Amino acid sequence: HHHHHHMVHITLDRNTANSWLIISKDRRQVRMGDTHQNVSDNKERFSNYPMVLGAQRFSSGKMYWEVDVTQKEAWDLGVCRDSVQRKGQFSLSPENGFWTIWLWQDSYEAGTSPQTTLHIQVPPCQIGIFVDYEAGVVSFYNITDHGSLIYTFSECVFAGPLRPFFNVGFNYSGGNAAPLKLCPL
Ligand SMILES: COc1ccc2sc(N)nc2c1
Numbered sequence: 001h002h003h004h005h006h007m008v009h010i011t012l013d014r015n016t017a018n019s020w021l022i023i024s025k026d027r028r029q030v031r032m033g034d035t036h037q038n039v040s041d042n043k044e045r046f047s048n049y050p051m052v053l054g055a056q057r058f059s060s061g062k063m064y065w066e067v068d069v070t071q072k073e074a075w076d077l078g079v080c081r082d083s084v085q086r087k088g089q090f091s092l093s094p095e096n097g098f099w100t101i102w103l104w105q106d107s108y109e110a111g112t113s114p115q116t117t118l119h120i121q122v123p124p125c126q127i128g129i130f131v132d133y134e135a136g137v138v139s140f141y142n143i144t145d146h147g148s149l150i151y152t153f154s155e156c157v158f159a160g161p162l163r164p165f166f167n168v169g170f171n172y173s174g175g176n177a178a179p180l181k182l183c184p185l
Contacts (some may be wrong), residue, residue, distance in 0.1 A: 001139075001147050003130040006062040007185045010054045010164050016044050016086075017052040021168065024179075027055070031179035032171045047087045054164030057082055063131045065164065066143055066183040069103070070125045073176040074169030076102040077127055078111070079138055081160040099138040099153045100165060101127075110140075110151045118150055126183055131162060143183075 011027035019041065022033045032050050046052065058079075067077055076092060078100030085096065092098040092111035100111035101118065108118035120142060127150070128141035136156035142148045169176050 001128070001130065001141055001149070003062070003064045003128065003139075003141070006064040006130070008056065008063045008065055009185070010056055010065045010182050012166070012182075013053050013055040013163075014039075015042065016046065018046045018050045021050060021052055023052070028182040029179045030166060030168055031177065032168050034171075044086055048089055049167055050169060051076075051165070051167045053080070053166070057161040057163055058131060058133060059161045060133050062133075064128060066126050066128050067166070068126050068179075068181040068183055071178045072103065072169065072180070073173060074102075074104050075180060076100050076111070076165070076167035076169075077129065077180075078140075078165050079129070079131055079162045080165040081158065082163050083160055094153070094156065097160070098165065099156060101140050101151055102167070108150070110153070112153075116151070120150060121145070122148075124150075129164070133158065133162070 012023050020033045021030050023030050081097030092100045093113040108120050110116040122145035124142045124144045126143035128143050130139040138153040140150040171177050
């Protein structure tokens, strides 16, 4: 891909984070804490899952960013509508305002309804996310494997401003403590 030149500087929005997340001072890394992080609750925070949004809102143009997933067993990445549900149980699907992929139990899947099996030969340590708002496209790239395509959502019906979307995953196993990191340009 030649999407690198639409690079955007993403930062995490603390106010949207699940109350167990620890976001770095620079707002570029997030990990699961082993306890509640001593913040007040609010209607914006994701309650059920270890999710957080980027601060940036996109309503036009082409945007690209990269995320480091090194040594994680579970995570979700992509974009979502600014108005997605925050509280209670929900599935990650376009119908609910999400355009995501994930790793779970040694398989990679795209968040379609129902979910789509991904075919990844080289387990990624860094993922590139490309959004073309006008074209209705969200694409995922394997930066570890020379930028190879992972998945394209096309004919997307965004129906609102978009925000970068992250899930660090639970750490029941003790093998998923590592952070998600936004990679430098
Ligand atoms: C790549 O794995 C990492 C990186 C940073 C940290 S801080 C912590 N408690 N666990 C980890 C694991």
